[PDB]
Amino acid sequence: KPHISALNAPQLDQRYKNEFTIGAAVEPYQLQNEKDVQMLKRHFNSIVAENVMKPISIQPEEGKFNFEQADRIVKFAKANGMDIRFHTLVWHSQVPQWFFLDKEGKPMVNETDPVKREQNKQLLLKRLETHIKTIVERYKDDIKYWDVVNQVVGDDGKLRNSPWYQIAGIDYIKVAFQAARKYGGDNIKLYMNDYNTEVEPKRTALYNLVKQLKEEGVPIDGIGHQSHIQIGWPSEAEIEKTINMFAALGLDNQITELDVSMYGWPPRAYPTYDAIPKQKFLDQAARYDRLFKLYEKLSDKISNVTFWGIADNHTWLDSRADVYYDANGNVVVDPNAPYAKVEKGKGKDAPFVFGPDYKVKPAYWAIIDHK
Ligand SMILES: O[C@@H]1[C@@H](O)[C@H](O[C@@H]2CO[C@@H](O[C@@H]3CO[C@@H](O[C@@H]4CO[C@@H](O[C@@H]5CO[C@@H](O)[C@H](O)[C@H]5O)[C@H](O)[C@H]4O)[C@H](O)[C@H]3O)[C@H](O)[C@H]2O)OC[C@H]1O
Ligand SMILES: [Cl-]
Ligand SMILES: [Cl-]
Ligand SMILES: [Cl-]
Ligand SMILES: [Zn+2]
Ligand SMILES: [Zn+2]
Ligand SMILES: [Zn+2]
Ligand SMILES: [Zn+2]
Ligand SMILES: [Zn+2]
Ligand SMILES: [Zn+2]
Ligand SMILES: [Zn+2]
Ligand SMILES: [Zn+2]
Ligand SMILES: [Zn+2]
């Protein structure tokens, strides 16, 4: 099956249109890149901001709101009949730090006096409410799906002990969802989003958290499974079990940040795309074949599958593609093997079904057929 230009291959959204939308994460510069635009128009019917809707992009100083970059995604989406997802209202990752400073500019995590800690809690929660309010009041008629909180459960199975949690405890999660529902109304759909949702003890900690929150009337419509996965891990059986277990709570599932890395963890990458052997693309294609067959089997529990980029020329996985060199300067990709130094984030991953030249990969054929 040939390595033809994606730009006029059979449309990926159309293949799956009764099963789930097919989305892509974008940067605004891609909306001014001819090829990226034609890719979005041709293959996708859902869109998400990779970065420009994060808290630090939207409100980098209190009261200073930058909607200009988000607005461009929204406009493009509306003009092309795409669903939009909002990524994300609340996250621990370089939030703007002003959220977590007390009335004197001191970090709130340092306060020892209980009455002052409680005032800080209330103050952070008010700030959270205003951030959400302002965003949802602006986009509630345009944006259907919302990542309300991101990565709030730790890999150890405990609530992630971020400044949100240290200052406000569990109420930050409750307040985030209540606020989104209050200002956005009943027709926006609210998600909790996380990675390694398939993995214990995180998976059961997430299930227990969401079950409790719903029992308490906190409005949560679904779970976003970031799905930053590998060729051989996690298994399809474990993916299946995860999806089924949340759907049994009455939750929607979205696959929100799908990519299939060529590597393991910590990754030992090839230094360029050219160096990735052909067989890796075939192993990737068989993985995508199995994965999309599974998503199709569960299509009544999954409303969306979104890739965390467009084509292999741009992927955040490159920032993790560390290149290992032996003493003679040869590249090392075997996870156990000797090496002398590492160049962090300098290699090249290849995670999508579309190549860096915008031609289809063997993974594309694996998911566009009906076998
Ligand atoms: O442009 C960039 C943006 O794209 C970027 O977007 C955000 C990045 O993605 C989301 O967060 C990251 C998800 O991946 C996590 O790493 C995990 C760590 O755990 C590993 O688990 C192991 C895998 O191998 C097994 O065998 C082992 O037993 C497991 O424990 C897993 O492989 C990794 O993927 C990162 O820590 C997260 O940050 C986020 O929501 C997107 O918004 O943001 C930055 C920007 O520069
Ligand atoms: Cl190349
Ligand atoms: Cl398939
Ligand atoms: Cl990126
Ligand atoms: Zn389309
Ligand atoms: Zn379409
Ligand atoms: Zn090449
Ligand atoms: Zn090259
Ligand atoms: Zn569906
Ligand atoms: Zn990017
Ligand atoms: Zn190529
Ligand atoms: Zn090519
Ligand atoms: Zn197939």
The full DSSP string for 34-72 is: HHHHHHHHHH-SEEEESSTTSHHHH-SBTTB---HHHHH
Does the beta carbon of 130 sit less than 6 angstroms from any atom of ligand 1?
no
The CA distance from 16 to 137, in Å, is 32
In the DSSP assignment, the letter for residue 12 is H
The CA distance from 190 to 174, in Å, is 12
Give the amino acid at 314: H
Give the amino acid at 150: N
Give the amino acid at 51: N
Q: Give the residue carrying structure tokens 């033809």.
A: 4
Asked if residue 67 lies in contact with residue 58, where contact means CB atoms within 8 angstroms, the answer is yes
For this entry, resolution in Å reads 2.0
Specify which residues 190 forms β-bridges with.
146
Distance (angstroms) between ligand 2 centre and the Cα of 86 equals 33
The CA distance from 321 to 271, in Å, is 8
The CA distance from 145 to 140, in Å, is 10
Strand 21-26 versus strand 222-225 pairing type? unpaired
Asked if residue 204 lies in contact with residue 157, where contact means CB atoms within 8 angstroms, the answer is yes
The CA distance from 326 to 321, in Å, is 16
CA dihedral of 38, 44, 50, 55, whole degrees rounded to 10? 120
Distance (angstroms) between ligand 5 centre and the Cα of 339 equals 46
Q: What's phi and psi for 256, nearest 5 deg?
A: -100, -25
Nearest CA to ligand 1 atom 29: 265
Residue 197 neighbours by CB under 8 Å, 6+ apart: 203, 206, 223, 225, 226, 242
Domain-by-domain residue ranges, the chain?
A: 1-371
Residue 65 neighbours by CB under 8 Å, 6+ apart: 58, 59, 134
Which H helix or E strand runs over 302? strand 302-307
The CA distance from 259 to 78, in Å, is 25
Contacts 24+ apart (CB under 8 A), 60-66: 60/96, 61/96, 61/98, 62/96, 62/98, 62/127, 65/134
Kindly give the number of the ligand 1 atom that is closest to the alpha carbon of 228: 34
Residue 150 neighbours by CB under 8 Å, 6+ apart: 87, 88, 90, 91, 93, 193, 194
C-beta atoms surrounding 75 within 10 Å = 12
> Quick one: CA dihedral 133, 136, 138, 141, positive or negative?
negative
The CA distance from 255 to 247, in Å, is 13
Pick the CATH number of 1-371 from 1.10.1040.10, 3.40.1740.10, 3.30.70.920, 3.20.20.80: 3.20.20.80
Question: Which is nearest to 236 in space by CA: 198, 283, 195?
Answer: 198
The CA distance from 282 to 106, in Å, is 54
Strand order in the sheet with 331-332: 331-332, 323-325, 341-343
Give the amino acid at 131: H
For residue 49, is it left (φ>0), alpha (ψ between -120 and 50) or beta? beta
Question: Tokens at residue 204, please?
Answer: 């059961």
Strand, helix or coil at 75?
helix
Asked if residue 67 lies in contact with residue 138, where contact means CB atoms within 8 angstroms, the answer is yes
Give the amino acid at 355: G
Distance (angstroms) between ligand 13 centre and the Cα of 298 equals 15
CA atoms within 13 A of residue 153's CA, in its CB half-sphere: 25
The experimental technique used to determine this model is: X-ray
Question: Which is nearest to 257 in space by CA: 151, 138, 159?
Answer: 151
The CA distance from 139 to 131, in Å, is 13
The CA distance from 181 to 260, in Å, is 33
Distance (angstroms) between ligand 1 centre and the Cα of 96 equals 20
Residue among 156, 193, 195 whose CB has most ligand 1 atoms within 8 A, to mutate? 195
Q: Give the residue carrying structure tokens 């590492």.
A: 342
Q: Where are the alpha helices (DSSP H) in 59-201?
A: 68-79, 114-139, 163-168, 171-184
The CA distance from 268 to 324, in Å, is 6
In the DSSP assignment, the letter for residue 222 is E
Q: What's phi and psi for 344, nearest 5 deg?
A: -75, 125
